[PDB]
């Protein structure tokens, strides 16, 4: 499903970015 | 996914994992 | 796609590079 | 495209993905 794909890709990207931000150093 | 945040992104990250970065 | 590969990717890459340091 | 970033983001995405692919392991 197109929108499911989009929001899941967004969630994945966002979650990675959040972890990599929280890493801080 | 095939509009925005394209497969290339996921593929890049998968390649980065495969390369043994994380 | 009108807005392909969003600022979020750049922010991710930046934070990745920061986290990596190297 | 008028939105800006796109072509450079794409170029960087491709270049980095290719560089990472050359890691081969």
Describe this structure in words.
The PDB classes it as antibiotic. The entry lists the keywords pore-forming peptide, homodimer, disulfide, antibiotic. It forms a tetrameric assembly. NMR structure of antimicrobial peptide distinctin in water. The complex is a heterotetramer, with two copies of chain A (25 residues) and two copies of chain B (22 residues). Chain A is an all-alpha fold and 25 residues long. Chain A has one domain (1-25). Chain A has one helix spanning 2-22. Chain A starts with a helix and ends with a helix. Helix content of chain B is 55%, strand content 0%. Chain B has one helix at residues 7-18. Chains in contact: A-B, A-C, B-C, B-D, C-D. The C-D interface holds C 2-5, 7, 9-10, 13 and D 1, 3, 5-6, 9-10, 12-13, 16.
Question: Span from first to last CA of chain A?
Answer: 38 Å
Mass-distribution shape of chain B = rod-shaped
Global structural class of chain B: mainly alpha
Number of helices of chain A: 1
SSE ordering of chain B: H
Indicate the proportion of strand residues of chain B: under 5%
Give the number of DSSP strands of chain A.
0
Helix content of chain A: over 70%
H/E element string of chain A? H
Radius of gyration of chain B: 10 Å
PDB class: antibiotic
Keywords: heterodimer, disulfide, four-helix bundle
Assembly: tetrameric
Entry title: NMR structure of antimicrobial peptide distinctin in water
List keywords for this structure.
A: mainly alpha, B: 22 residues
Topology:
The complex is a heterotetramer, with two copies of chain A (25 residues) and two copies of chain B (22 residues).
Chain A: H1 2-22
Chain B: H1 7-18
Summarize the structure.
Chain A is an all-alpha fold. Chain A contains 1 helix and no strands.
